[PDB]
């Protein structure tokens, strides 16, 4: 039984009322439950039996049922509502959880600061060069980070990583890094990161044995 | 007091076993039912295995079955989970939790499996600033973790001394197996030849500490 949970990510406001569904693959009666959960904290029992608040949880949360259809809703949703939220069916004897729903707060769009970070000479003894393309604090998450080696689009051999929101600008960093051989970095000239995000594009290069 | 205390977890080879605790204080354990529910870094909930207050009847997630086992005892008070044949998609923090009006009220604090052929401390290499990493009156520094294994690597810098600005990223998964992570740090362009900026990084399972004092890059000409 596959708890399908919508929508994967939100962001509102403080006071905004807000509202995650959960839809059971086959009937689980009414045998469903809504956790939230705060980075490396383990989850919280908000509501039980769909619709019944759990004892103690803030009275803003509410659940409800039509069918297979299950939904969480925060009539006024305060900071300390930041987080995760994951439905139960506790139906028969195998659980299901649904996939999350994060809540992230809304801010004004951000273009991100770009800085480009050529391999250290340290590093190219172990034969690897590394190319660190860095995206700075900008809103909302989606960018797209494109590598250019001697003006060769690169694919296949570029990993990125992701902040959560910072806990004070709401903002989002992402890194982006190119993994090269000594050789095949030794050989071409012209590094750069090209940066797309909202409706701006900034492009940062260097060129090998530059400053 | 109610009190569910976790303990048994830690590195452990593929195709191997370890033995997670969830010792239940307060109440009976035989009175309740009792589940365990794990969570890979960075992804959801996932159940594993339950077990039944009357004639400890069990039942497990299809992804578990035959391969790990859920037991109790009640001179203990404390439910274990033995993990045999262990995977790497078994990599993750492992929850007690206690059944409670059809859902789970309780919680352990959780313990971390984490599946590992060998240890690897890591490299670090600066990631220095200059004039491709100055806009606005900003210099972005930092520090590549690179080829560890298993996690976590934590990063400080300057001992805790440098906290705005910083950002320490997920770890990633290289295609060699071998994890990698960075930590960057944005700060005023004038203070770079008035602080000195070096990161602290902490790998615990090879019982590596580095430091390395990131400077701007020299130029040769
Ligand atoms: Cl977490
Ligand atoms: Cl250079
Ligand atoms: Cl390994």
């Known amino acids: 039984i596959q708890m399908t949970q919508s929508p994967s990510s939100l962001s509102a406001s403080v006071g905004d009322r807000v509202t995650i569904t959960c839809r059971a693959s086959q009937s689980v009666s009414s045998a469903v439950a809504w956790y939230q959960q705060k980075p490396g904290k383990a989850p919280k029992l908000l509501i039980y039996?769909?619709?019944s608040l759990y004892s103690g949880v803030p009275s803003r949360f509410s659940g409800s049922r039509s069918g297979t259809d299950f939904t969480l809703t925060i009539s006024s949703l305060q900071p300390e509502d930041f987080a995760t939220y994951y439905c139960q069916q506790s139906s028969y004897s195998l659980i299901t959880f649904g996939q999350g729903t994060k809540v992230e707060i809304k801010r004004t769009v951000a273009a991100p600061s770009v800085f480009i970070f050529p391999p250290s000479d340290e590093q190219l003894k172990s034969g690897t060069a590394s190319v660190v393309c860095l995206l700075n604090n900008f809103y909302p998450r989606e960018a797209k980070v494109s590598w250019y080696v001697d003006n060769a689009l690169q694919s296949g051999n570029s990993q990125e990583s992701v902040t959560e929101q910072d806990s004070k600008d709401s903002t989002y960093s992402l890194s982006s890094t190119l993994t090269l051989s000594k050789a095949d970095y030794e050989k071409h000239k012209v590094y750069a990161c090209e940066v797309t995000q909202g409706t701006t594009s900034v492009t940062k290069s260097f060129n090998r044995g530059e400053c | 007091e109610v009190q569910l205390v976790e303990s048994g977890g830690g590195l452990v080879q593929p195709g191997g076993s370890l033995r997670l605790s969830c010792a239940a204080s307060?109440?009976?354990?035989?009175?309740?039912?009792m589940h365990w529910v794990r969570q890979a870094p960075g992804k959801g909930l996932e159940w594993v295995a339950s077990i039944s207050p009357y004639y400890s009847y069990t039942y497990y997630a299809d992804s578990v079955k035959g391969r790990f086992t859920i037991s109790a005892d009640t001179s203990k008070n404390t439910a274990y989970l033995q993990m045999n044949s262990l995977r790497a998609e078994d990599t993750a923090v492992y929850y007690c939790a206690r059944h409670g009006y059809g859902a789970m009220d309780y919680w352990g604090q959780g313990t971390l499996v984490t599946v590992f052929n060998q240890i690897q401390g890591p490299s670090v290499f600066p990631l220095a600033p200059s004039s491709k990493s100055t806009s606005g009156g900003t210099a972005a520094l930092g520090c590549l973790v690179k080829d560890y294994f298993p996690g976590p690597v934590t990063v400080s810098w300057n001992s805790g001394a440098l906290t705005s600005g910083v950002h320490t990223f997920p770890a990633v998964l290289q295609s060699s197996g071998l994890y990698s992570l960075s930590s960057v740090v944005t700060v005023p362009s004038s203070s770079l030849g008035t602080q000195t900026y070096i990161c602290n990084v902490n790998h615990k399972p090879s019982n590596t500490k580095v430091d390395k004092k990131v400077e701007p890059k020299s130029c040769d000409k």
């Open positions: 307060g109440f009976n354990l035989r009175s309740y039912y």
């Open positions: 039996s769909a619709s």
